[PDB]
Design a protein around this ligand. Structure first.
Ligand SMILES: [Mg+2]
Ligand SMILES: [Mg+2]
Ligand SMILES: [Mg+2]
Ligand SMILES: [Mg+2]
Ligand SMILES: [Mg+2]
Ligand SMILES: [Mg+2]
Ligand SMILES: [Mg+2]
Ligand SMILES: [Mg+2]
Ligand SMILES: [Mg+2]
Ligand SMILES: [Mg+2]
Ligand SMILES: [Mg+2]
Ligand SMILES: [Mg+2]
Ligand SMILES: [Mg+2]
Ligand SMILES: [Mg+2]
Ligand SMILES: [Mg+2]
Ligand SMILES: [Mg+2]
Ligand SMILES: [Mg+2]
Ligand SMILES: [Mg+2]
Ligand SMILES: [Mg+2]
Ligand SMILES: [Mg+2]
Ligand SMILES: [Mg+2]
Ligand SMILES: [Mg+2]
Ligand SMILES: [Mg+2]
Ligand SMILES: [Mg+2]
Ligand SMILES: [Mg+2]
Ligand SMILES: [Mg+2]
Ligand SMILES: [Mg+2]
Ligand SMILES: [Mg+2]
Ligand SMILES: [Mg+2]
Ligand SMILES: [Mg+2]
Ligand SMILES: [Mg+2]
Ligand SMILES: [Mg+2]
Ligand SMILES: [Mg+2]
Ligand SMILES: [Mg+2]
Ligand SMILES: [Mg+2]
Ligand SMILES: [Mg+2]
Ligand SMILES: [Mg+2]
Ligand SMILES: [Mg+2]
Ligand SMILES: [Mg+2]
Ligand SMILES: [Mg+2]
Ligand SMILES: [Mg+2]
Ligand SMILES: [Mg+2]
Ligand SMILES: [Mg+2]
Ligand SMILES: [Mg+2]
Ligand SMILES: [Mg+2]
Ligand SMILES: [Mg+2]
Ligand SMILES: [Mg+2]
Ligand SMILES: [Mg+2]
Ligand SMILES: [Mg+2]
Ligand SMILES: [Mg+2]
Ligand SMILES: [Mg+2]
Ligand SMILES: [Mg+2]
Ligand SMILES: [Mg+2]
Lengths: 136, 55, 74, 175, 104
RNA sequence: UUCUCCCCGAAAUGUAUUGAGGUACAGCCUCGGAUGUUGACCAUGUCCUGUAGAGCACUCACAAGGCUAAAACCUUAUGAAACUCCGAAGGGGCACGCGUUUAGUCCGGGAGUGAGGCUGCGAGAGCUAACUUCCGUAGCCGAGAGGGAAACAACCCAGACCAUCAGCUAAGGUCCCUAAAUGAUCGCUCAGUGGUUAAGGAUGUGUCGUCGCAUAGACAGCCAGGAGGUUGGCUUAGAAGCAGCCACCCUUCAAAGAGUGCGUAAUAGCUCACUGGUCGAGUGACGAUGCGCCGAAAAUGAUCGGGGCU
RNA sequence: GUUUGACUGGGGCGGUCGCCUCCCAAAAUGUAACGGAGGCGCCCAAAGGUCACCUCAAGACGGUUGGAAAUCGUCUGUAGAG
RNA sequence: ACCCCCGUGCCCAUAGCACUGUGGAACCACCCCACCCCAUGCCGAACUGGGUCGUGAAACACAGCAGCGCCAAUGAUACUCGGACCGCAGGGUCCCGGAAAAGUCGGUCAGCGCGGGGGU
C-alpha cells in the first residue's frame, strides 16, 4: 500500500516491463498481460482473497508495489491552480511482469486462488508454473 | 542507374523535397541517368520510395 | 510554487577540427567538464578560449579529465 | 540433437519457430540455429546440469551443456539459447536444483518447508558426472530450523561455490 | 609524504613553456640533479654526485650545482625550471641553486 | 473602400510594452543594385550530447529470507521527471566535394503579419475525457481547385498557363444506382458477422501442439457390488463421509476411499470413486491461434449511401 | 479636473509580476502552462593578492570526565566530506 | 652488449589491491645525533641540519599468483532514422538500415622513452 517516502506527484507513459519476468520465489505465479496501473487496493484485494483461500497455510509474495502517486483535481473546478495533492498510489504493470506467486499449495488450489484474485484486476492475466530458470 | 519520379513531393518532409530537387526531378514521370558515386547513391537512397530505381 | 525558472545558454562553442582565431571562446561550462589544454586559457567562469590561432582539437580520457587544445597552423 | 544454419540474417529463423543458438569455448564461438520443439523436449529432460550432443549438418558431433536461454517476456516461448562446449575437466560453477526428501516432522505440526534457494551453484562438478539433482533430507528439521550449505552433502570432486553459512531450505511456521 | 611532489610538478610543468626542467633529487646523500626537456621524453645534462665528496651535505651539494652549471653551459642552456622535489628550498638545495646559476 | 491582365508571395513566431483584438525591433514577402557560387541536398572525416533503452555503482523508494542489542552487512528481488557504473538510433558545429543540383549574402525603397486550425509522433496540465489546453516536431487548411474518403478545411492521391467528343496512370475501385473482372486459385464465417464496446461466459466452427487411458479389450450405456474398525478424535444441546476443527491408519478383496453430490436439527435413504459380465471402437483433460456466439437498453421513421449480397 | 495597472481556461476574490538552480525540454542551443520543487534583493578587511604547509565523512577495536555521537590512539577509507 | 639500481617522463586500473618470495653494504630505505641554520597551532614524528655502524625488520624495488577489483567479446534482444500499418484507447505490428545496457566466452596483475650509478 502507500509508501512512507518522497516527492508527491509524477507523470505517465509506457513500455514493456523488464524488472521481474521470472518467478524467483515460490512455486507458481500469476502474471500480467496488459499495461495498466494496478495501485493499492486492487492489489490488497488480491492479497485478502488469496489469504482467505490459502491462509493457515501457504506463502504469499507480492512482487509488485504501489510506487507511483496519482492525482485527482477537486470536485468540479476549471483547469485551475496546480494538480491534486493525493488520491491513490499505483504500480505500473507491463506484460510478463509477475505480480503473484504462491508457495506450499497444490497445483489445483493455486489455480483456484489465482482465478479468484484475477477476477478483480483491471488486466486479464495468465498463470504459470516456473519453467527452467536462469538469472542468479 | 536510371531513375524516375513516381510519387509526388507534396505532403513529404523537407529533406525529401530538396533531395528530389537536387537529383534533377521536377515532375512525376521525369526520368534521369545518374552516376553511382557515394553521395548520389545516398541521395537516391534518401528518397527511394519516391523513385523507381531501374537497376 | 511553480512560476520560477531561468535561461543561461551554455556548452561547447568551438568543436574539434575547427579553425579558431586567437581569443575565440571554445567552451562555456559551469565547472571543469573540459580542462584547458595546451594553448588554451580559462576565465572566471571556466570558459576556455584560444590563446593563439590554430586548429581546435579534443583530448578525451575518462570524463574526469578531458582537455581542449590548439594546434597552430604553419 | 540437430541444427543447421547460422546466418547473420534471422528472417528464416522466426518462420519455422526454430530457436537461434550458439556454441563457444576458448577456441571457437560459432553461432548456429536448431529446431524448437525437440529442443524443448530436451531442455525438459535436462536443465542446466543436463547435456546433449549437437550434430551440425557438417558431420561432427559435439557435446554441449546448456548455459542460458533468453526468451520472450510477453509470449512465454523461449527465444534464444547458448550451449557451451565443455572439455572434460570439471565444468565451471554449474547450477544444481535443490530437492527435498522425506516428510519433515516440522510439516506435521503446522509448519511448512520452504526452499529458500531453488538452485545452488557448485563449482567443479566434474563433467559427465554432473549432479542432475541434489537431495536434502528435511525430516530432522523442526519449525524455524535452517539447513545451510554447510549441510548439503556432495558427490565426487565437488565443492560448494556459495558461502556455506547462507540459508538454503528452511521450515516456516503458520501464517 | 607525497602530495607536494606532484603539486610542484604540476605547477612546474604549467610554468614550463619554453624553459627546461631541473629536478633536484635530495632524499638520500645522492643529491642528483637533471635537466629535462619537457615534451621530448629526454634529459640532457645530469650532474649526480656519486663520485664527488666535499664534506657536509650542504657544501658537497654545492659543487654539484657547479658541476651541472658547466655541463648545461656546454649545451647552450638559456634558463630552466627548478622542479624542487618536496624539499623546502633549504640551504642544501638552495645552495645547489645558488651554485647552479651563480656559475651558469 | 469601385477598371483589367502579367510576376513574385507571406505572417499568425521571438523579446518588449498601464501591454495582451494595439504598437516598436527582429523574423518571414516583394522590388532595384552589388558579389557573384559562398546557398540546397547527400557522402566521408572529425568533434559535442545524456534522450530511448538498460542498470542499481550513488540519492530516495521498495519485496522474501540470513546474521544481529533492531543499523550496517550477505543471498534473492524491484521502481524512478527532478537517481545514473553505462548508453544508442538520431541531432548540432567544422572541413571537404571526392557530386548532384540552385540558390545564398550585402546594400537601399515598399509591405503585410504578430487571433491561427487539424492530424501523426514526443511530453506536461486533465480522468492516459474532450472538435480540451500549453510546448516540441512533420505535413495539410489558412491562401489549394482537381480525384478518393455517401455527404465532409484538415485524412488518402495530386499542386489547376489556355484549347481537344485523343492516350497513361495515383489514392481509390470493377453485381445495379455508377466508369471499370458476377475475374482466376487454396481456404474461412452461416453470424447479416460483414454493417455498433469490455470484464466475463460457451462442447459454434476450421489449424495446430501437450498430456493420460486403453482391444492382453478403455470412454458413455446396462445388470450385480459398494467394506468391518467407526456414531474416526475435538466439536457443540446434536453433528455419525457431508455445521466447523486434526488426520486420511489397519483387515478383505476382483473390492468398496475415515471417502463426491442430494437428504434430516442428527439418523437413515439415493448415488459417487474402484471391481465384475455383455458390448465393442476411440476416448478424456489442458494449451495458441483464424472467423464467428452471448454479454448488446433511449427518446419523430428506418437503413451498410441505397437496392440488395452467402 | 482627474486617478483608481496587467495576467487571468469569462470576470471578481485568491495568487503572480525582477533575478538564480533543477525537472519538464523529445542525448546540440532554444522552447509554454494559475506545470512539478527551491533560493536572492546578501555576505567577507579578510571568506580577497600571493607565498608556504596540512587532507576529509564514516565505521571497528582500546581507552579519564564520557557512557549512541564528546576528546585521544591504531586500522580501513576517490570522497561516502568540505 | 647483457643485469640491476636512482631519478624521471608518455600512458594514467588489461597497468590497482590482497596472499607470497627475494634484495643491502652498489643504489634507496629505515637508523644515530640535533644548541644552532630550519621547524612543529604540543611533539625533530613531518619539514630540517650533521653521519657511521646496525638492519632490510618496516618502506621501497623486483618476481610469483587470478581470491578481489578493472578490461571485456560472439549469438540475441531493447531501443531507433526511414518506409508502411492496427487498435475506440491505453498500447501493438511489418519491411529497411543503425545498435545498446547488462550478462556468458574470455583477458589482464602493463606497455613504451630519456638520463645518470654501479655490476659482468
Ligand atoms: Mg511501451
Ligand atoms: Mg515497442
Ligand atoms: Mg534484472
Ligand atoms: Mg504517409
Ligand atoms: Mg507561385
Ligand atoms: Mg527581458
Ligand atoms: Mg499582441
Ligand atoms: Mg517590421
Ligand atoms: Mg534581388
Ligand atoms: Mg554560405
Ligand atoms: Mg557548398
Ligand atoms: Mg527509462
Ligand atoms: Mg562493466
Ligand atoms: Mg560544385
Ligand atoms: Mg528595408
Ligand atoms: Mg509602393
Ligand atoms: Mg499570438
Ligand atoms: Mg501554436
Ligand atoms: Mg494528470
Ligand atoms: Mg483546439
Ligand atoms: Mg486569415
Ligand atoms: Mg482540395
Ligand atoms: Mg498550402
Ligand atoms: Mg475535394
Ligand atoms: Mg463526391
Ligand atoms: Mg465519413
Ligand atoms: Mg471537420
Ligand atoms: Mg475548400
Ligand atoms: Mg488503361
Ligand atoms: Mg491499385
Ligand atoms: Mg458499370
Ligand atoms: Mg466473384
Ligand atoms: Mg474475451
Ligand atoms: Mg458423457
Ligand atoms: Mg480633460
Ligand atoms: Mg484585465
Ligand atoms: Mg503563491
Ligand atoms: Mg537541450
Ligand atoms: Mg533536441
Ligand atoms: Mg512559445
Ligand atoms: Mg506537472
Ligand atoms: Mg623507480
Ligand atoms: Mg610484502
Ligand atoms: Mg654488495
Ligand atoms: Mg628517526
Ligand atoms: Mg622485507
Ligand atoms: Mg551481435
Ligand atoms: Mg533506412
Ligand atoms: Mg517509424
Ligand atoms: Mg531491425
Ligand atoms: Mg556488454
Ligand atoms: Mg606485481
Ligand atoms: Mg636505462
Amino acid at each position: 500500500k502507500r509508501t512512507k517516502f518522497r516527492k508527491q506527484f509524477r507523470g505517465r507513459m509506457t513500455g514493456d516491463a523488464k524488472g521481474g519476468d521470472y518467478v524467483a520465489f515460490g512455486d507458481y505465479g500469476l502474471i500480467a498481460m496488459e499495461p495498466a496501473w494496478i495501485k493499492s487496493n486492487q492489489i490488497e484485494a488480491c492479497r485478502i482473497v488469496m489469504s482467505r483461500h490459502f491462509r493457515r497455510g501457504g506463502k504469499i509474495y507480492i512482487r509488485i508495489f504501489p510506487d507511483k502517486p496519482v492525482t485527482k483535481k477537486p470536485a468540479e473546478t476549471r483547469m485551475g491552480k496546480g494538480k491534486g495533492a493525493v488520491e491513490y498510489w499505483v504500480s505500473v504493470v507491463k506484460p510478463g511482469r509477475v505480480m503473484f506467486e504462491v508457495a506450499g499449495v497444490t497445483e489445483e488450489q493455486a489455480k483456484e486462488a489465482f482465478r479468484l484474485a484475477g477476477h478483480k484486476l483491471p488486466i486479464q492475466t495468465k498463470m504459470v508454473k516456473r519453467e527452467v530458470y536462469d538469472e542468479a | 542507374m536510371k531513375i524516375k519520379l513516381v510519387r509526388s513531393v507534396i505532403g513529404r518532409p523537407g529533406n525529401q523535397v530538396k533531395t528530389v530537387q537536387a537529383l534533377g526531378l521536377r515532375k512525376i514521370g521525369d526520368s534521369r541517368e545518374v552516376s553511382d558515386t557515394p553521395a548520389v547513391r545516398g541521395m537516391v537512397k534518401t528518397v527511394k520510395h519516391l523513385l523507381e530505381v531501374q537497376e | 510554487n511553480g512560476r520560477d525558472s531561468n535561461p543561461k545558454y551554455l556548452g561547447v562553442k568551438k568543436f574539434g577540427g575547427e579553425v579558431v582565431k586567437a581569443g575565440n571562446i571554445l567552451v562555456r561550462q559551469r565547472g571543469t567538464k573540459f580542462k584547458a589544454g595546451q594553448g588554451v586559457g580559462m576565465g572566471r567562469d571556466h570558459t576556455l578560449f584560444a590563446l593563439s590561432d590554430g586548429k581546435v582539437v579534443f583530448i578525451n580520457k575518462g570524463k574526469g579529465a578531458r582537455f581542449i587544445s590548439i594546434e597552430a597552423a604553419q | 540433437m540437430e541444427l543447421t544454419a547460422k546466418p547473420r540474417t534471422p528472417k528464416q529463423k522466426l518462420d519455422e519457430s526454430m530457436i537461434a543458438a550458439v556454441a563457444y569455448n576458448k577456441e571457437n564461438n560459432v553461432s548456429f540455429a536448431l529446431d524448437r520443439k525437440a529442443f524443448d523436449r530436451a531442455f525438459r529432460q535436462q536443465s542446466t546440469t543436463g547435456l546433449f550432443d549437437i550434430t551440425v549438418e557438417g558431420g561432427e558431433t559435439f557435446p554441449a551443456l546448456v548455459k542460458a536461454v533468453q526468451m520472450d517476456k510477453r509470449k512465454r516461448a523461449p527465444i534464444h539459447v547458448d550451449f557451451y562446449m565443455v572439455t572434460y575437466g570439471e565444468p565451471v560453477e554449474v547450477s544444481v536444483p535443490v530437492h527435498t526428501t522425506g516428510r519433515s516432522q516440522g510439516e506435521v505440526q503446522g509448519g511448512l518447508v520452504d526452499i529458500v534457494v531453488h538452485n545452488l551453484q557448485i563449482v567443479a562438478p566434474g563433467p559427465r558426472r554432473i549432479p542432475q539433482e541434489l537431495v536434502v533430507d528435511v525430516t530432522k528439521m523442526n519449525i524455524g530450523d535452517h539447513i545451510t550449505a554447510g549441510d548439503i552433502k556432495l558427490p565426487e570432486g565437488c565443492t560448494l561455490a556459495a558461502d556455506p553459512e547462507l540459508t538454503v531450505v528452511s521450515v516456516l511456521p503458520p501464517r | 609524504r607525497r602530495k607536494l611532489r606532484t603539486r610542484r610538478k604540476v605547477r612546474t610543468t604549467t610554468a614550463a613553456s619554453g624553459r627546461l626542467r631541473l629536478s633536484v633529487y635530495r632524499s638520500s646523500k645522492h643529491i642528483y640533479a637533471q635537466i629535462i626537456d619537457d615534451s621530448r621524453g629526454q634529459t640532457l645534462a645530469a650532474a649526480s654526485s656519486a663520485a664527488l665528496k666535499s664534506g657536509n651535505k650542504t657544501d658537497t651539494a654545492a659543487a654539484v650545482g657547479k658541476a651541472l652549471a658547466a655541463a648545461a653551459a656546454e649545451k647552450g642552456i638559456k634558463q630552466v625550471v627548478f622542479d624542487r622535489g618536496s624539499y623546502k628550498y633549504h640551504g642544501r638545495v638552495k645552495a645547489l641553486a645558488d651554485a647552479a646559476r651563480e656559475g651558469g
